[PDB]
Amino acid sequence: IKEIAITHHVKEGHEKADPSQFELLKVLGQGSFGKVFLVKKISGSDARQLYAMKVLKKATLKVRDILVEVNHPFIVKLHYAFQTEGKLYLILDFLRGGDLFTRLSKEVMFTEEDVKFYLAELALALDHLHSLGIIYRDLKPENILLDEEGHIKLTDFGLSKESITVEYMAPEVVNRRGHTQSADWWSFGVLMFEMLTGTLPFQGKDRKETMTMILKAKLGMPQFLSPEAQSLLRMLFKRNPANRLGAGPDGVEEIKRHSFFSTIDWNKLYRREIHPPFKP
Ligand SMILES: Nc1ncnc2c1ncn2[C@@H]1O[C@H](COP(=O)(O)OP(=O)(O)NP(=O)(O)O)[C@@H](O)[C@H]1O
């Protein structure tokens, strides 16, 4: 594993930035690694532009140019990174659509096909990262936002962060036995399960018990899902990572060709030709 320290970045077009070129407007949210702020760029070619800002102690990209390669239609863009006073500042797209789960909660009647749209965009994003040797690792609802047009935007791209949710973690991750991109497809299944049923597949009274459940508990198949949805769940919820959908020879194509996704034109999806089920 090649660990790439994140210390500096300037998007093409921009000029090198520093803390004095921004002003704080408000807090956008709070993550495990700290608050996320709304900031305004006060000077430079992009003066007056709004961005999100994270302030960490440090961040590294573990990989089994890169900060440009991770660019994708459904992944947040990093515009700047700089360090000042033992702190790392990350300046990112301001994602304006709020989180996906909140948008879904505002809808009484959403369908399997609605959820399928968001899962499909998420799958493209995940595979993109995998293609670069990156594993998302900590995929959870709070990382899945929407842009102003209602398309998926992940809030990170696999950074291992240090500041200044076991429910989504794969069995092989829980027991510290190993770790590959296959773990991301388990998390993917958990998100699918949760969006389609309104409940988590594994959750105990505390983290200790949740972990044991992930490793050994039975799981009932939701009976009011389509046969295709049930099949995808069965294929993602393999505790042996080598046998999990997406881990075979054809990789992500195993997922894209699955009957659940038969309605999706992946090329049109990538190009954002398909209208999202709901608008911000
Ligand atoms: N680019 C963004 N634009 C707007 N809001 C954001 C952005 N990134 C994060 N947020 C908000 O901040 C919350 C936390 O985001 P997250 O990326 O999880 O932060 P983090 O510090 O990396 N913590 P975590 O990822 O949980 O370890 C999200 O759920 C959003 O509500």
Which phi and psi angles does 92 have, rounded to 5°?
-125, 165
Residue in the block written with tokens 């999990």: 244
State which fold the 1-95 domain adopts: Phosphorylase Kinase; domain 1 (3.30.200)
Distance CA 178, CA 7 (A): 28
Q: Is the CB of 75 under 6 A from ligand 1?
A: no
From the annotation, which residues make up the binding site for ATP? 28-36, 54
Question: Distance, CA 155 to ligand 1 centroid (Å)?
Answer: 6
Question: Rounded to whole angstroms, how far apart are CA atoms 204 and 18?
Answer: 45
CA–CA separation, 25 and 11 (whole Å):
22
Cα separation, 225 vs 221, in Å, equals 9
Q: Distance from CA of residue 161 to its chain's centroid?
A: 15
Cα 10 vs. chain centroid, distance in angstroms?
23
Distance CA 131, CA 134 (A): 7
Q: Specify the ligand 1 atom closest to the Cα of 54.
A: 21
Q: How many C-beta atoms surround the C-beta of residue 20 within 10 A?
A: 9
Residues 273 and 265: their CA atoms lie apart, in Å, by 10
| Cα distances (angstroms) measured from residue 94 to each of 59, 65, 83 | 20, 22, 20
* Any ligand 1 atom below 6 A from CB of 98: no
Half-sphere exposure of residue 149: CA atoms within 13 angstroms, side-chain side: 10
| Residues 25, 18: Cα–Cα separation, whole Å | 17
Which positions are annotated as active-site residues?
Answer: 138
CA angle 159/162/166 to nearest 5° reads 70
CA 237 / ligand 1 centre spacing (Å):
27
SS3 annotation, the chain: CEEEECCCEECCCCCCCCHHHEEEEEEEEEECCEEEEEEEECCCCCCCCEEEEEEECEEEEEECCHHHHCCECCECCEEEEEECCCCEEEEEECCCCCEHHHHHHCCCCCCHHHHHHHHHHHHHHHHHHHHCCCCCCCCCHHHEEECCCCCEEECCCCEEEECCCHHHCCHHHHCCCCCCCHHHHHHHHHHHHHHHHCCCCCCCCCHHHHHHHHHHCCCCCCCCCCHHHHHHHHHHCCCCHHHCCCCCCCCCHHHHCCHHHCCCCHHHHHCCCCCCCCCC
Return the CATH number of the domain spanning residue range 96-280: 1.10.510.10
Domain ranges of the chain: 1-95, 96-280
* CA dist 194 → 59, 93, 239, 256 (Å): 30, 27, 18, 20
Experimental approach = X-ray
Torsion, Cα of 109, 233, 258, 151 (10° steps): 40
